[PDB]
Design an enzyme around this catalytic site. Structure first.
Site, short mmCIF file in Angstrom:
data_model
loop_
_atom_site.label_atom_id
_atom_site.label_comp_id
_atom_site.label_asym_id
_atom_site.label_seq_id
_atom_site.Cartn_x
_atom_site.Cartn_y
_atom_site.Cartn_z
N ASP A 192 0.82 -1.22 0.00
CA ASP A 192 0.00 0.00 0.00
C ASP A 192 0.86 1.27 0.00
O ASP A 192 0.49 2.26 -0.63
CB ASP A 192 -0.92 0.04 1.23
CG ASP A 192 -2.30 -0.61 1.02
OD1 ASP A 192 -2.57 -1.26 -0.01
OD2 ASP A 192 -3.15 -0.46 1.93
N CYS A 237 -2.52 0.66 -13.49
CA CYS A 237 -2.56 0.67 -12.03
C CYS A 237 -3.72 1.59 -11.65
O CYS A 237 -4.79 1.50 -12.26
CB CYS A 237 -1.20 1.05 -11.46
SG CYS A 237 -0.39 2.55 -12.22
N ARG A 266 3.42 2.54 -10.96
CA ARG A 266 3.70 1.11 -11.14
C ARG A 266 3.70 0.71 -12.63
O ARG A 266 4.52 -0.11 -13.06
CB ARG A 266 2.67 0.27 -10.38
CG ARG A 266 2.70 0.49 -8.88
CD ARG A 266 1.56 -0.21 -8.15
NE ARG A 266 1.33 0.40 -6.86
CZ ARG A 266 0.35 0.04 -6.03
NH1 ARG A 266 -0.49 -0.92 -6.39
NH2 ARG A 266 0.21 0.67 -4.86
N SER A 267 2.75 1.24 -13.40
CA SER A 267 2.66 0.91 -14.83
C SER A 267 3.93 1.34 -15.56
O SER A 267 4.41 0.64 -16.48
CB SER A 267 1.44 1.61 -15.45
OG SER A 267 0.20 1.05 -15.01
N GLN A 313 6.56 7.88 -10.53
CA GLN A 313 5.92 8.94 -9.74
C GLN A 313 6.74 9.43 -8.55
O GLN A 313 6.41 10.48 -7.98
CB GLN A 313 4.58 8.46 -9.18
CG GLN A 313 3.45 8.44 -10.17
CD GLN A 313 2.15 7.90 -9.56
OE1 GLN A 313 2.03 6.72 -9.22
NE2 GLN A 313 1.18 8.78 -9.41
#
Ligand code: JMM
Length: 282
Positions: free
Chosen positions: A181, A215, A221-222, A262
């Site tokens: 998370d 994502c 994440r992508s 990110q």
């Protein structure tokens, strides 16, 4: 510089935030006018994440052709990817329309439906064989065929039917279920194992349309997934694998979608994944 020793040099000097801010400063800025039209407000999950006009995927519709999705076309590596946001309640039918129209074999999902106690994307595939889904706005039917649950990821076989023509196709759903998370994984081993499973399925290969990867926003994440895949492929193709420059590859990918990677922690994790992956390949 090479990668593994550039890596230790940034760790010892603690300069990951400065490296990452340089990337942010040098990244391309292209217009995203279609994404910002008022009629598309409920088609975007986040107001600050939009596809560029020049690389956006168009739906084959005359009313409204907009979806928050981008084509990342890597010329030297000879790989293409579609990066998109997690589907919204009012875009699940558009999502599957795109999969159909672009002739994709596989969908790669890097998030859970609920994270941090909040919804990160719609429940857009069926959970039981006998309870199929019909998307009336785009005239598609989706059935769960089989499911294989492993410790870090789940693979599903799905049947997508175009109800207008009665044509059917098999779609593979690759779901990485264990990204934490907060932060990034401590080791890249399970993420690399997952990437290799997607590769082995044929979903990334030229005989199919581009893989669809998402994502929640479709950039973090992508971005890590496609950056690692492309860098490892280039290390196999070139005479000198130490010439592959992960920052340059990332800036090339950011010509096609804003914001890929990110955080500085995601940047460090991408380096780690490519470094460890290059040892297993040989
Ligand atoms: O290329 C592969 C591969 C080929 C077939 C199956 O996996 N991998 C595996 C995972 N790797 C790791 O370093 C894990 C930390 C052990 C390296 C990349």
């Amino acid at each position: 510089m090479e990668m593994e020793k550039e890596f230790e040099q940034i760790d010892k000097s603690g300069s990951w935030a400065a490296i990452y801010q340089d990337i942010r400063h040098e990244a391309s800025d292209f217009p995203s006018r279609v994404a910002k039209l008022p009629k598309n407000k409920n088609r975007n999950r986040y107001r600050d994440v939009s596809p560029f006009d020049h690389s956006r995927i168009k739906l084959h519709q005359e009313d409204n052709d907009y979806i928050n999705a981008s084509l990342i076309k890597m010329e030297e590596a000879q790989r293409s990817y579609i990066l998109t946001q997690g589907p919204l309640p009012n875009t699940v039918g558009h999502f599957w329309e795109m999969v159909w129209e672009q002739k994709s074999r596989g969908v790669v999902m890097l998030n859970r439906v609920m994270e941090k106690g909040s919804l990160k994307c719609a429940q857009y595939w069926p959970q039981k064989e006998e309870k199929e889904m019909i998307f009336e706005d785009t005239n598609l039917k989706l059935t769960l065929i089989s499911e294989d649950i492993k410790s870090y990821y789940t693979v599903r076989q799905l049947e997508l039917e175009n109800l207008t023509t009665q044509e059917t196709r098999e779609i593979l759903h690759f779901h990485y279920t264990t990204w934490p998370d907060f932060g990034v994984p401590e080791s890249p081993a399970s993420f690399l194992n997952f990437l290799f499973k997607v590769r082995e399925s044929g979903s990334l290969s030229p005989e199919h349309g581009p893989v669809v990867v998402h994502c929640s926003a479709g950039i973090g994440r992508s971005g890590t997934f496609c950056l690692a895949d492309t860098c490892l492929l280039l290390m196999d193709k070139r005479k000198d694998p130490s010439s592959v420059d992960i920052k340059k590859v990332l800036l090339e990918m950011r010509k096609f979608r804003m914001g890929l990677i990110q955080t500085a922690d995601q940047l460090r994790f991408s380096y780690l994944a490519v470094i460890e992956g290059a040892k297993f390949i040989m």
